């Protein structure tokens, strides 16, 4: 159960990290737009 529970935490970390990745992509595109 402690392994399954932890795998859930690792999964929920990956899910949250994808949002951070999405956000960084927006920032890059925004700065690109400013340069324009």
């Amino acid at each position: 159960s402690g392994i399954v529970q932890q795998q859930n935490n690792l999964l929920r970390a990956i899910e949250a990290q994808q949002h951070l990745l999405q956000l960084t992509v927006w920032g890059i595109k925004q700065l690109q737009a400013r340069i324009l």
């Binding site: 402690g2 392994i3 529970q5 932890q6 935490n9 690792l10 929920r12 970390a13 949250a16 990290q17 949002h19 951070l20 956000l23 927006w26 920032g27 925004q30």
Partner: protein, 38 residues
């Protein structure tokens, strides 16, 4: 959004992730103890 909303969102997601890492770290210790006598 605004760049400020962006900062806040990043901070929030970052806070969520570090807590998940601390949780997983505490789990890791317990799990590694258990898997001696098992």
């Amino acid at each position: 959004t605004t760049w400020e909303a962006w900062d806040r969102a990043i901070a929030e997601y970052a806070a969520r992730i570090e807590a998940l890492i601390r949780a997983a770290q505490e789990q890791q210790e317990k799990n590694e103890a258990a898997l001696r006598e098992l």
